[PDB]
Write an enzyme that holds these catalytic residues in place. Structure first.
Site, PDB file in Angstrom:
ATOM      1  N   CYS A  11       0.825  -1.144  -0.032  1.00 49.71           N
ATOM      2  CA  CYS A  11       0.080  -0.153  -0.033  1.00 49.71           C
ATOM      3  C   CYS A  11       0.893   1.336   0.132  1.00 49.71           C
ATOM      4  CB  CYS A  11      -0.915  -0.009   1.274  1.00 49.71           C
ATOM      5  SG  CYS A  11      -2.373   1.064   0.975  1.00 49.71           S
ATOM      6  N   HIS A  65      -1.739   1.166   6.213  1.00 52.49           N
ATOM      7  CA  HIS A  65      -2.637   2.265   5.464  1.00 52.49           C
ATOM      8  C   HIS A  65      -1.944   3.337   5.036  1.00 52.49           C
ATOM      9  CE1 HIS A  65      -6.303   3.289   3.803  1.00 52.49           C
ATOM     10  NE2 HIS A  65      -7.059   4.083   5.056  1.00 52.49           N
TER      11      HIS A  65
HETATM   12  C1  LIG Z   1       8.402  -4.791   0.367  1.00 49.10           C
HETATM   13  C2  LIG Z   1       7.108  -4.265   0.290  1.00 49.10           C
HETATM   14  C3  LIG Z   1       6.101  -4.291  -0.733  1.00 49.10           C
HETATM   15  C4  LIG Z   1       6.376  -4.867   1.780  1.00 49.10           C
HETATM   16  O1  LIG Z   1       6.812  -4.138   2.712  1.00 49.10           O
HETATM   17  N1  LIG Z   1       7.081  -2.647   0.857  1.00 49.10           N
HETATM   18  S1  LIG Z   1       6.027  -1.415   0.956  1.00 49.10           S
HETATM   19  O2  LIG Z   1       4.579  -1.888   0.884  1.00 49.10           O
HETATM   20  O3  LIG Z   1       6.242  -0.445   0.152  1.00 49.10           O
HETATM   21  C5  LIG Z   1       6.073  -0.954   2.594  1.00 49.10           C
HETATM   22  C6  LIG Z   1       4.823  -0.987   3.297  1.00 49.10           C
HETATM   23  C7  LIG Z   1       5.151  -0.686   4.716  1.00 49.10           C
HETATM   24  C8  LIG Z   1       6.186  -0.383   5.327  1.00 49.10           C
HETATM   25  N2  LIG Z   1       6.294   0.119   6.648  1.00 49.10           N
HETATM   26  C9  LIG Z   1       5.633   0.094   7.708  1.00 49.10           C
HETATM   27  O4  LIG Z   1       4.518   0.262   7.453  1.00 49.10           O
HETATM   28  C10 LIG Z   1       6.254   0.738   8.997  1.00 49.10           C
HETATM   29  C11 LIG Z   1       6.299  -0.208   9.982  1.00 49.10           C
HETATM   30  C12 LIG Z   1       7.066   0.035  11.352  1.00 49.10           C
HETATM   31  C13 LIG Z   1       6.473   0.532  12.368  1.00 49.10           C
HETATM   32  C14 LIG Z   1       7.459   0.869  13.453  1.00 49.10           C
HETATM   33  C15 LIG Z   1       8.781   0.352  13.612  1.00 49.10           C
HETATM   34  C16 LIG Z   1       9.120  -0.149  12.340  1.00 49.10           C
HETATM   35  C17 LIG Z   1       8.538  -0.476  11.089  1.00 49.10           C
HETATM   36  N3  LIG Z   1       5.574   1.909   9.305  1.00 49.10           N
HETATM   37  C18 LIG Z   1       5.846   3.132   8.712  1.00 49.10           C
HETATM   38  O5  LIG Z   1       6.467   3.106   7.779  1.00 49.10           O
HETATM   39  C19 LIG Z   1       5.290   4.360   9.245  1.00 49.10           C
HETATM   40  C20 LIG Z   1       5.375   5.553   8.710  1.00 49.10           C
HETATM   41  C21 LIG Z   1       4.605   6.701   9.171  1.00 49.10           C
HETATM   42  C22 LIG Z   1       3.555   6.721  10.251  1.00 49.10           C
HETATM   43  F1  LIG Z   1       3.140   7.788  10.796  1.00 49.10           F
HETATM   44  C23 LIG Z   1       3.661   5.332  10.902  1.00 49.10           C
HETATM   45  C24 LIG Z   1       4.198   4.192  10.188  1.00 49.10           C
HETATM   46  C25 LIG Z   1       7.289  -0.519   4.523  1.00 49.10           C
HETATM   47  C26 LIG Z   1       7.615  -0.866   3.280  1.00 49.10           C
END
Ligand SMILES: CC(C)(CO)NS(=O)(=O)c1ccc(NC(=O)[C@H](Cc2ccccc2)NC(=O)c2ccc(F)cc2)cc1
Ligand SMILES: CC(C)(CO)NS(=O)(=O)c1ccc(NC(=O)[C@H](Cc2ccccc2)NC(=O)c2ccc(F)cc2)cc1
Lengths: 251, 252
Positions: free
Chosen positions: B14, B202
């Site tokens: 996402c 999200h």
């Molecule tokens: C390879 C793939 C397709 C699958 O990962 N990449 S992706 O979908 O682009 C992809 C999708 C999601 C993430 N990270 C997170 O959700 C982290 C998850 C996380 C939370 C705490 C500590 C470590 C990691 N939280 C955030 O960054 C975040 C940013 C701003 C905010 F206010 C709140 C949270 C990284 C990459």
């Protein structure tokens, strides 16, 4: 008499605003100078001008078919709908409501940019004892206010008074206070003549919106419109109302 | 009419669809990629995706993951790190494509900023009295030279991790000062926004509509809310009020 419009559940602000916009002949002319939103808006506005009841679902449908989610706009301030209509009419071109500000920013060096707005949104100031709330005080309070000055004034002027305030606790409230306004308003350097007034009634979550507007020919007899209900109205009734949106035209 | 195609969610992509929709809202990046791919690979597939996104179709971003697999990356590690790190893994690998090229080895990508040459301006969010972007820029080994395409990463992750919810003001026009004519003015092209708790995936992109074919190279005024397959209009006030995570700007 002018035709009324029916309410599709919650529509009252849209028909109030359409009745107000139809009382702006330069905006009508610019639409004439221009399915697409501008033509539907011209059909709606020309029908509401030129002296049964009408339906403005065509406007909601052209907006939705443009992938606007209108059902999320009842949760916002009513005025954001007006900004959406003007911003979508500028997409068909690339403006009668356009006010233009020249701003300067400094912190050694300075930078002069330009900013554009569709209306003048004025914070309602706190009433001091012995002096009533006037629209000139709000306008002066908005002018006094990174600086910003008015450098191009519009032919048709919309003035939104921020009747919806928010407390420090984050809970919203409606300011009920009456602001004195005259039909002849001089913007400090141009002069403007009042054409329509949108007012709100009830609690903030009520959608009770009503428009006073001039009769079509500039005429001198005022009309009160609440959806299908249209009647004659005095000027003192218009001036005594609790204004939310004011629509002026340049004299 | 004036819409962009959406994207699919493969497991949890996402943020990646959010970033692709944000990146295809920068025309100078797409022009740089069109020039860099004249060599003939991450640049080719990335430009294909970005050129498709800036035009009810929905595309498959799956191919990007595959070339991320072919350039020797773990991919599945990125769920345990900050999202913005994936952007670095893009840009760094594009810089790795710059080296080892006999044709376009002096063709630096438009996001590089001199201080050291970095990919984006990361700002830590202070606490207070409303927070504004100029307060974060004042809290920022200063910037030396400014990129054509500017990415601003707001540190919503603080440290045990913490999610920072506070809204920070940002403006559609942003001027940054340096000594002489080195400082420059930028216009806001896209906003990546996070919702929910820190482990909710999200992510949502607010991006400008693609330029019309009746006025090419003229920036549109209409904004779009994009969440994977779901694309809709969005007012400007909706964009300016969102708790921003990434801020993509283009030099004016
Ligand atoms: C390879 C793939 C397709 C699958 O990962 N990449 S992706 O979908 O682009 C992809 C999708 C999601 C993430 N990270 C997170 O959700 C982290 C998850 C996380 C939370 C705490 C500590 C470590 C990691 N939280 C955030 O960054 C975040 C940013 C701003 C905010 F206010 C709140 C949270 C990284 C990459
Ligand atoms: C229904 C639809 C969206 C199409 O489905 N179109 S609409 O009828 O034009 C349309 C109908 C209703 C609204 N919003 C309101 O009334 C908000 C509702 C509201 C109230 C509090 C906080 C957020 C939103 N309160 C006002 O603005 C208001 C203005 C001045 C006042 F002194 C007091 C209240 C907006 C648009």
């Amino acid at each position: 008499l002018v035709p009324g419009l029916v309410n599709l559940g919650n529509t009252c602000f849209m028909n109030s605003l359409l009745q107000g916009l139809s009382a702006c002949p330069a905006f009508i002319r610019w639409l004439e100078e221009f399915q697409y939103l501008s033509l539907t808006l011209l059909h709606l506005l020309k029908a509401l001008s030129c002296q049964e009841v009408l339906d403005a679902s065509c406007l909601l449908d052209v907006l939705r078919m443009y992938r606007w989610q209108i059902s999320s706009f009842e949760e916002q301030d009513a005025h954001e709908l007006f900004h959406v209509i003007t911003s979508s009419l500028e997409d068909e071109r690339d403006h009668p409501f356009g006010v233009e500000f020249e701003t300067t920013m400094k912190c050694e060096e300075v930078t002069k940019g330009k900013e554009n707005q569709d209306s003048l949104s004025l914070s309602i100031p706190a009433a001091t004892w012995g002096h009533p709330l006037t629209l000139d005080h709000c306008l002066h309070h908005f002018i006094s206010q990174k600086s910003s000055k008015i450098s191009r004034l519009p032919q048709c002027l919309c003035i939104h008074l921020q009747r919806l305030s928010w407390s420090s606790h984050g809970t919203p409230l409606k300011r009920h206070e009456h602001v004195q306004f005259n039909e002849d308003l001089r913007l400090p350097l141009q002069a403007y003549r009042l054409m329509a007034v949108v007012v709100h009634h009830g609690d903030m979550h009520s959608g009770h919106f009503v428009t006073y507007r001039r009769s079509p020919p500039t005429s001198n007899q005022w009309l009160w419109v609440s959806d299908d209900t249209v009647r004659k109205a005095s000027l003192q009734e218009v001036l005594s109302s609790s204004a939310y949106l004011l629509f002026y035209e340049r004299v």
